Amino acid sequence: RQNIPLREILYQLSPYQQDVIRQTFTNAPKTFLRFFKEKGVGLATFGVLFFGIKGYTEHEMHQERLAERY
């Protein structure tokens, strides 16, 4: 394994001197909002392109069925 020159001091605490699932209920709305802020633009771009092109195609398909309609 490689040799990485590094100067630090690392502290770790035991898993049994800590809570397991009690900060999830506190950090849950902040995590939700941070996720949507970080990935908001791409999800919006994907949704707008997909649903707009699908709606345009479906509208034109209905128009073409009505154009041949007796």
Add this chain to the structure above:
Amino acid sequence: ADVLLLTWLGGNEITPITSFVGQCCTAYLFFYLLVCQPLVGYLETQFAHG
């Protein structure tokens, strides 16, 4: 979005508008895979570390 649109179009019937949209989607798929990934990536490297 382009790939998901191609997935939606495959379950429809052959229609002139669906043919046109599928042709445009295939053209954009090739455009992204062969033009965007090298050239835009090179521009990003020139912007970041140039």
Add this chain to the structure above:
Amino acid sequence: VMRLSEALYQTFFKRSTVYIPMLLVGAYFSNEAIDYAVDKMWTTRNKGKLFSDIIAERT
């Protein structure tokens, strides 16, 4: 003692792209000769018993 010729070496042996087509034509002719010898021996031994012998006999 016995030794391959230099002029025959420089033509059919020095490059693999010349050696391989020569190998394939030699393989074709070797298969043809083996087929001919086996078929001639079989037809000579079993003469008068095959179906074609009866058909040519009925002409």
Add this chain to the structure above:
Amino acid sequence: PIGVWSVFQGYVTPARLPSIQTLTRVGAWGGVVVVGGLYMVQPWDWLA
């Protein structure tokens, strides 16, 4: 950084490219696969 990155940086010169003799020796493998396919299939006197 193997591929288009090599040609964007200027690492593919007239030098470091294969010579004409190298391309001819590689290009001589085109007849080998043709002869091998014709040996495998044997479409005799099929040329029009």
Add this chain to the structure above:
Amino acid sequence: ISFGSYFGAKDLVGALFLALVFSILVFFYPDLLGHPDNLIPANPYSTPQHIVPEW
């Protein structure tokens, strides 16, 4: 960090999500992703109206 301690339970969580989706698909909507025409025996002389593959 070591794989076998830290990324075993992390893979187990995602495997349990996948098992939930799999169990829903098997037991509640078994024919949702399919095609109803594949429940007809094959007839080489009659073709269906729409011939589409799996999704």
Add this chain to the structure above:
Amino acid sequence: RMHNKIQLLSVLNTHLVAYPTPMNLNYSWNGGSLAGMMLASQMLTGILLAMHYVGHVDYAFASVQHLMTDVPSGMILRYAHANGASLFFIVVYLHVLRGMYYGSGAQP
């Protein structure tokens, strides 16, 4: 070490127990293990399915129906093998899209 004396235990230890992995991998790095689990599930369900399927015309449809209604747990096995292909493709597609997003195929 006990794993240092049998070569099977050494390889298994090196590649499944002590293998160094980045500590900041998120949940979009679980695509590969899910794809392997789906491959193993498909292999198991299919090997079980092939004990009741007959690969002949005029028997294939009836053998699938006999599998569905008469083999104990046969309907579960068939529906699992059918929907497992869909889930296998979902997982592998998300894996490929992860690799497309991060440039995971680059050197080396």
Add this chain to the structure above:
Amino acid sequence: GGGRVEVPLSEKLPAVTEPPRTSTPATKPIVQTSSLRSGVKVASINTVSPISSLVLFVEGGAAAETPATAGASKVLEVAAFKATANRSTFRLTRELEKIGATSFARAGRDHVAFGVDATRLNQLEALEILADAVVNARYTYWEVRDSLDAVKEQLAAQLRNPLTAVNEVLHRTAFEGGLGHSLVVDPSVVDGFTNETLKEYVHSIMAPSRVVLAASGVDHAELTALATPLLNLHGNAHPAPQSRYVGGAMNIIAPTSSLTYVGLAFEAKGGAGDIKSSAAASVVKALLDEARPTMPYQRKEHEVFTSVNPFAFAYKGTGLVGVVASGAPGKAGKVVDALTAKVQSLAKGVTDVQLATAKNMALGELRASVATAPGLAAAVGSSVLATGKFSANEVAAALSGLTAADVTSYVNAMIKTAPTFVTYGNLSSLPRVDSIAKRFA
């Protein structure tokens, strides 16, 4: 097909003597010297050889080192002719290898020399490469860091010979000041070396009045006219620690030395500046040559000695003439006694045949040093740097015009001066130091 005419046969009509024979010069060429407007002195001598040698002599060496920049001359020997402001290392290496030229960096005890040897058709290329590699050198961090390893094995290999170590300790004991510093230092001296240390040493040693351009087989007017824009140097003369002879004695402890080495030395008064004293010192060096290998496989047997190796160094203002003799570990006192007996018998008089033989040996060494173009260029450069002129004809005249009375007087004046005494090896047998330096008194 290529040529098929065999080399016992002459080549055909496409083999022409189209260049005619140029007439020889009337006299032997003389050394012509001048100075640039920047202050760099340029001296050159024309030759009929087809090889032109260009060497650049800079005052420095171990005499210009400090405790901080210790061992910088040995590092400069390896780190020279690398990346400059105008060329990379790759470009300079390819430009040297294209014309078949060779480069060296050589560090003395009072100077560093850089040189390029090429043919007479590529003298402009050699001059430009040498000037660019000396003046505009960069001394990058990574190149010096990677060269330090090879420096360490070159010093470790050069210290394997006991004569090098004896020479170092003898120069330490004989002089105080610049000439007493160590040239071949221990490998661990340069363990903390960086490119800043080398740049500091180079900035100290470089000055226009301390740089001499010497050339062999180059026209002088052309060389000055084309080296004026290249050797326009600036800088300040870092102070030189002038050395003085004091003498003394020392020791070396070597754990696995199969032999035992004893050095004896005296001061040559006047240094390289005095022609006659240097000539007399060279004659004394030849007179101390006991076993000179003039024939193959000849076995001259001494009672006590295993090897005899005299020397005569002539620095600026002072010198060091002496002899180093080996011997068995149990016979070191006998080695000392035999060396004292040899110097005393030299002081008792030389007898005609020995004087003629030593004069011929000194003349042969002097003429064989300048036989080739790089040797002649190095001799011209060192003599101009140390004195201001090249006087090989005067040195030969001084060697030939030496009488036995003058040599006897020279050795008599030498033995009155306090000597320098150095031992070496796993020393388990030695006479006491007070009686060591008594036999010449």
Add this chain to the structure above:
Amino acid sequence: SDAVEVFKPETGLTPTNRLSMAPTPYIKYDEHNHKRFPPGTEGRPFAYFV
């Protein structure tokens, strides 16, 4: 470099030391399985034809 400091051989006139100091040009191979051709036999080998 010297062979005594690099190869570090044993001292003596052993069979290996004799060939190390002066190898012989009359090398004898084993001929129970294959008989050698005369030395210096030129030409491209007949085994390619076989």
Add this chain to the structure above:
Amino acid sequence: TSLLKQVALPVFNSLATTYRSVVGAKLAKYGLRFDDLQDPLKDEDVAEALRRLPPDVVVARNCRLRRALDLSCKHEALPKDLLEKQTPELSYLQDVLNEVRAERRERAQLGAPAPYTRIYYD
């Protein structure tokens, strides 16, 4: 097209500055510099240029990389007092890497390959 190219040079500078500002604002939340994004495993020119650096710079780079990876594992950012000191556009690798790339360009015009290979771990 050279006249339109001359107009496109301040446009190139404007897009370069805007991209660098946005990415550096994204970079400074992890304490990273621009030069920390370059990977020796990805690029052999970076692997050679990183070998030419003094060891304290490599130690500082490795510390910044470990700090950013710890922050990514924690899903956190730097504190505001620490975030105000970040300078993501300070160059430590650019001149070294530029000289390495110029050397590789100069060797390729004469037919020589690069004197360093890719990094192999097997």
Add this chain to the structure above:
Amino acid sequence: DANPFLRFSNPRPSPIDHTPLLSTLPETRITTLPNGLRVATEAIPFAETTTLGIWINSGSRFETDANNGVAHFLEHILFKGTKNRSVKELEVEVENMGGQLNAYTGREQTCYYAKVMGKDVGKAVNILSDILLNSNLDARAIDKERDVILREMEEVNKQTSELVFDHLHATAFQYSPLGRTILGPVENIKSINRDQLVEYMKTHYRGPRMVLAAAGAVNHDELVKLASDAFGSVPDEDAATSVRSLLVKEPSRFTGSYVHDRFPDASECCMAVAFKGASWTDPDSIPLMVMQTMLGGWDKNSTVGKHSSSALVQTVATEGLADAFMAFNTNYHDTGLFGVYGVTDRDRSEDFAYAIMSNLTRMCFEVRDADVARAKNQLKASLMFFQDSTHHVAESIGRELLVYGRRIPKAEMFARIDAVDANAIRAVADRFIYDQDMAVASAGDVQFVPDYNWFRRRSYWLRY
């Protein structure tokens, strides 16, 4: 761009015309005595020193199995006293002329020469003729040298490269005269005497096989007079016992073979691979010189090995495959040797072997013009460097009259070098290297050196 520091010089290899260097090069004068001995001088106009000596077309090749080692023992004996001068008389007289005597004994060539000053030409001629013609060859000195040679044989006191090259000559030239070592076996030294030395000198040291070559400060007519006075009494040669008749009678034979000399606790791994090369008179010997320059050589005390023009030097220096290596081109009267010798250890021996074989076979297919122009310029510059030292001038005069039969002029040599191009290099490499047998020799820690089939497989490429 610097204006004065960037003109005149660029790294692009271009052919150089060395024609103006020929205007001032001196001329060689040759005079043949009625004895058959040639006297050849080359006067350098302002030289102060002189190299002069006697070159003989003889050596270890022309011995027999019974007296193998006599020519090498002769240079131990010949300087130990003559019939007119003692040991001390010779020592004093050589010391007074300020020079040194020296001797070399090859497989096919022998020289005894003196490097003196210009005033001691006649004294050096007289001394050289005195050792050559009127030697004592005393039995006490023979016994005094036999024991020293036997001690250095028992100790295995030899250079590693000489050990490898002697093994290489022994296995490449099996059952021919060129496979013998110059030193000879232990038994011939243990049973040597004065009679064999007398018979060898009487048989081989004759008029048509001897050249008196002098360079530096020397007059041709005076050396002719001195040689006729001194060396005029050498016997002539029978037509039936000439050098050509001996070459025809016992010819050289090349055998593709393999040898290694394994040691149990060695550190280095020296190895040489050679192909059958060209004789001295083959016109393909000039392209082999150019190819040897193209392969070059390198040792690890240099630090610019990664910027080398040679691709083999670049590969070995960059990957650290060897501590030192060199390409050699050995030429004999009727055969030759061409290859690469190197020093490595046991963990890098196979990769060094692969680099040697891959760079040798590559010259048959791809050779670029820049490398050929560079190697031609380097070889011509190397030839001009030998003109600077009078010792090399005298050595080349002696060698060229012995083995070519004539003094090749410098204009002809430059023209023959300049006629080499990339097609010639490809043709010569195809003739000598491609799909040919080679000779492999190694010594030291050689347990990981590949066997002969590995080396034989890599003399050709299956991809073209």
